[PDB]
Amino acid sequence: SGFRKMAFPSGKVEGCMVQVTCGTTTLNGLWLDDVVYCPRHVICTSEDMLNPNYEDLLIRKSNHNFLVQAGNVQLRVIGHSMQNCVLKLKVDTANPKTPKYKFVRIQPGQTFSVLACYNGSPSGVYQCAMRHNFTIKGSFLNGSCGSVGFNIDYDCVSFCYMHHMELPTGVHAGTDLEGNFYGPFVDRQTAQAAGTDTTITVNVLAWLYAAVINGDRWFLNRFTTTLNDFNLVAMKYNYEPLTQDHVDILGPLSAQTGIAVLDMCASLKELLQNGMNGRTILGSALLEDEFTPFDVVRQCSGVTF
Amino acid sequence: SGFRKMAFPSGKVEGCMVQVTCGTTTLNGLWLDDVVYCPRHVICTSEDMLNPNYEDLLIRKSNHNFLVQAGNVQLRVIGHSMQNCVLKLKVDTANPKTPKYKFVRIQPGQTFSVLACYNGSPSGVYQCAMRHNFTIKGSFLNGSCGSVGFNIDYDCVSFCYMHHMELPTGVHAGTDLEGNFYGPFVDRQTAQAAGTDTTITVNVLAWLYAAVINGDRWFLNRFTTTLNDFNLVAMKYNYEPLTQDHVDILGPLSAQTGIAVLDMCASLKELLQNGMNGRTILGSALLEDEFTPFDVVRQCSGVTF
Ligand SMILES: *[C@](O)(C(=O)NCc1ccccc1)[C@H](C[C@@H]1CCNC1=O)NC(=O)[C@H](CC1CC1)n1cccc(NC(=O)OC(C)(C)C)c1=O
Ligand SMILES: *[C@](O)(C(=O)NCc1ccccc1)[C@H](C[C@@H]1CCNC1=O)NC(=O)[C@H](CC1CC1)n1cccc(NC(=O)OC(C)(C)C)c1=O
Ligand SMILES: [Cl-]
Fold first, then answer.
1. How many helices (H) does chain B have, and how many strands (E)?
2. Residue A138 CB contacts under 8 Å (≥ 6 apart), including other chains
3. Could you say which ligand is closest to the alpha carbon of residue B166?
4. CA distances from B258 to A85, A230, B247, B249, B294 (A)
5. Which of A54-81 are b and which e, b meaning 16 or more Cβ less than 10 Å from the residue's Cβ?
6. Residue A122 near residue A301, CB atoms below 8 Å
7. What positions does UniProt annotate as the active site of this protein (chains A, B)?
8. Nearest CB neighbour to A215, from listed B14, B138, B170
9. How far apart are CA A293 and CA A210, in angstroms?
10. Are A108 and A203 in contact (CB under 8 A)?
11. Nearest C-alpha to atom 40 of ligand 1 is from which residue?
């Protein structure tokens, strides 16, 4: 038993991290086959960060201006092109450690692991969730750009995130691996504000089920509710409206415990209205919303990679 | 910016996980150079778990009774022995992925990452801390035995923990890599109690420092305290006595923030007596005690491996 915020093992991804330098800017890149992916703002100086014309800067660069470093070895850049906000450096060597991989765009409420890197080497691994305002709550310092987020299914790594920027509230924003930002963000040094976020209700419900699976059951009551009466309360607390698709997604966890989803909604409704009265659930004093229903099933059943 | 519960990158350890089977029992092993380490109770049946005579059980086995599998390739066992509660299986092949490594024994209050495995393949990675009752609060299912806990310093892997068993409150117990249990636990299926645990005061203070570094300041107040008056308060709330060694250890974090340690102690003291008033600190509604002072500095400075 037990239930922890659990990251995917990062080995398959560590073997893909390199260091990309362009003039005096250094950040991380992702080396897959014979292409290195990194944020296009590697070609900027600190000066032209206010309003950079990336296409214009790129036409002034040559292949030898991009220094790519895998560990201690220099890779040789033989081509480059720009795709939205990512740079793609063709190098003359295919990464022998390249895993099976896809580039995917996740939806708000989905989770992934982050391998935080500096100078092409790994610092730490952690979980976070794509929020409804298209930010994430990560831990990123200077030089962390180009670190990636990913999921692993069997042996295939699904790359979903590449880090680009921090926002005023201490949250973070990035692109998919096609260079498209999540949310209304751009890679410029202008004032950008995240936007208002909601609690991922379907994840809170999943986590309560995880709690039941682990014997934490003080919060269960004998009541039921409807989607309407629940969403009335949920809206007051800035929780995302629960849909029947959400109820269906919670099906597997509902059957494993024998607690109908609307019965669990009645427990969440009471938790939201009465607080937690100084108590905890799975060692937490607040309601956790960064475990997907898949996360719970994965951790509570023992799936490996 | 941001502060997360962060695990060490797990690549170096992933290359060491193998699958060890003996009869109908399968668990995980750690393959370093030409030796595989795993819990000795891989040799028990479900029957003889009440009071296993391991020496008697071991002498009945030969090398070819130990099925060891690194990924999909079968290893050849050419010797075996027992050292306390770990089994050492000598194989004819040195693990080509062996990292630089040490075996260390961690002390209560230190942290490490756990690479949880099933059937010899890595499933997820998470941080936890050795509790003063010699338990950890992990996430372990049937078949996770043989999973190891570890820290990384630059390039060296320090193996500190191998998983063995679950205890009454849903917590976990294991050995170091010489097979010596942490705490008053034995590898038998008998009534064993963890013992009473305390909150790791020096870690709470370190995390309060991380909060200030990351812009969370509302808990700083106009007070100071002394070690003696603080320890009067901590004892009531089942916190570990704070020592002068603890004060000195928090020194670097104290200098980085310009908040004297005894001033931060006065902030913890008021938090303990009056709670948090519906506010949070680093997105947590309770006081976190599983970041050591070293974890905080390391995460906030960007140290890589
Ligand atoms: C990113 O470029 C990086 O990791 N490394 C490049 C680098 C910078 C400095 C020294 C060596 C190498 C950084 C990562 C940021 C910095 C701290 N935490 C992060 O996530 N990304 C940016 O600097 C980013 C570049 C923009 C997208 C093109 N950037 C520039 C200017 C402002 C901000 N945001 C900001 O000012 O934050 C607030 C909270 C509003 C003060 C920004 O993210
Ligand atoms: C460990 O052996 C393992 O991971 N795999 C062997 C295996 C078991 C079942 C099916 C296939 C393979 C487990 C790990 C445990 C199991 C679930 N969560 C864990 O952390 N260790 C044991 O099962 C352990 C073996 C004992 C040390 C020699 N064991 C056996 C019987 C009972 C318990 N604990 C227990 O009863 O918990 C309480 C809370 C007291 C009810 C036990 O840990
Ligand atoms: Cl063989």
1. 8, 13
2. A114, A116, A126, A128, A163, A171, A172, B2, B4
3. 2
4. 40, 47, 14, 15, 18
5. beebeeeeeeeebbbbbeeeebebeebe
6. no
7. 41 (for 3cl-pro activity), 145 (for 3cl-pro activity)
8. B170
9. 9
10. no
11. A168
Q: Which domain holds residue B254?
A: 201-300
Q: Looking at residue B78, which CATH number applies to its domain? A: 2.40.10.10
User: What is the distance in A from the centroid of ligand 3 to the CA of B140?
Assistant: 30
Say if ligand 2 is within 6 A of residue B117 CB.
Answer: no
Catalytic residues of A: 41, 145
The answer to whether the Cα torsion of B180, B182, B184, B188 is positive or negative is: negative
Distance A145 CA to ligand 1 centre (A): 8
The β-bridge relationship of strands B67-70 and B35-39 is unpaired
- In the Cβ-directed half-sphere of A135, how many Cα atoms lie within 13 Å? 22
Obtained via which technique? X-ray
Region class of B154: left (phi > 0), else alpha (psi between -120 and 50), else beta: left
Supply the CATH number for residue B296's domain: 1.10.1840.10
Which of A126, A305, A286 lies closest to A207 in space, CA to CA? A286
Could you list which residues have their CB under 5 Å from ion ligand 3? B 76
**How many H helices and E strands in chain A?**
8, 13
| Reported structure resolution in angstroms | 2.3
3-state secondary structure at position A117: strand
Give the pairing of strands A101-103 and A156-166: parallel
The verdict on whether B145 is a catalytic residue reads yes
